[PDB]
């Protein structure tokens, strides 16, 4: 059993009030009150982020931890926060975005955020059985949270396998992907194999709630995986009991228009 496994157990042991206080303590949280209502009312002329994913990917890019360029694929795009972010980047030439949709899953949000015309959305697509194609940048933000850490580990393992499939098709592609449960043993093993062949490393974004152990893998960074994970597990365990609130920051606004 790992420190991350214990983090999951203590998280599940929280009351509802404890859970709500814990998940937000010390995290950056974008102010979405305006964006939420524009989406609710059916407004399409908006560059405010369609989800909390936009600021996460923007932080990775702005830190230089990811390179978004060329033909981008967004595997598991959901509402599209990463697809709209990539499409707004001048170095990006096109985005092909895929998501399963269906009951209890987000469909793409359709807005005029800058470069929307360069995104081709496909809902109803399972990326785990879809053949890879040419891409310069491969993005994947899949990993559905569960109270069962073993299920989270298996979900994470499937994402890593998918990224190996896309690297087999595109050995030179930049890759950025969510690792939902980095502490599970089959995940560490899979990340070690990925890093051995393709380089890269893990990083925690400051927008990630303490209720998820998610870390992002990118081929553009480095670092010992086991140490990266254990540092993060210890930090999450130490935050149980902190009552400080989140740090509220403005939401990303990418502007609107075609590219
Ligand atoms: N097998 C699969 N094939 C395609 N999409 C999947 C999938 N499994 C999960 N997904 C979808 O992947 C999405 C991951 S959440 C993605 C959030 C996005 N990066 C943003 O910024 O808004 C979810 O919407 C989920 O429905």
Automatic annotation (TrEMBL):
S-adenosyl-L-homocysteine binds at residues 51, 81-82, 105, 126-127. GTP 1 binds at residues 8, 12, 16, 23, 145. S-adenosyl-L-methionine binds at residues 51, 81-82, 105-106, 126-127. GTP 2 binds at residues 11-12, 14, 19, 23, 209, 211. It is found in: Host cytoplasm, Host perinuclear region; Host endoplasmic reticulum membrane; Host nucleus; Secreted. GMP binds at residues 8, 16, 23. Residues 2-259 form the MRNA cap 0-1 NS5-type MT domain. It comes from the Viruses. Mg(2+) binds at residue 145. Induces the formation of ER-derived membrane vesicles where the viral replication takes place. Inhibits interferon (IFN)-induced host STAT1 phosphorylation and nuclear translocation, thereby preventing the establishment of cellular antiviral state by blocking the IFN-alpha/beta pathway. Inhibits STAT2 translocation in the nucleus after IFN-alpha treatment. Forms a heterodimer with serine protease NS3. May form homooligomers. This is Genome polyprotein. The chain holds residues 2518 to 2775 of 3414 of the full protein.
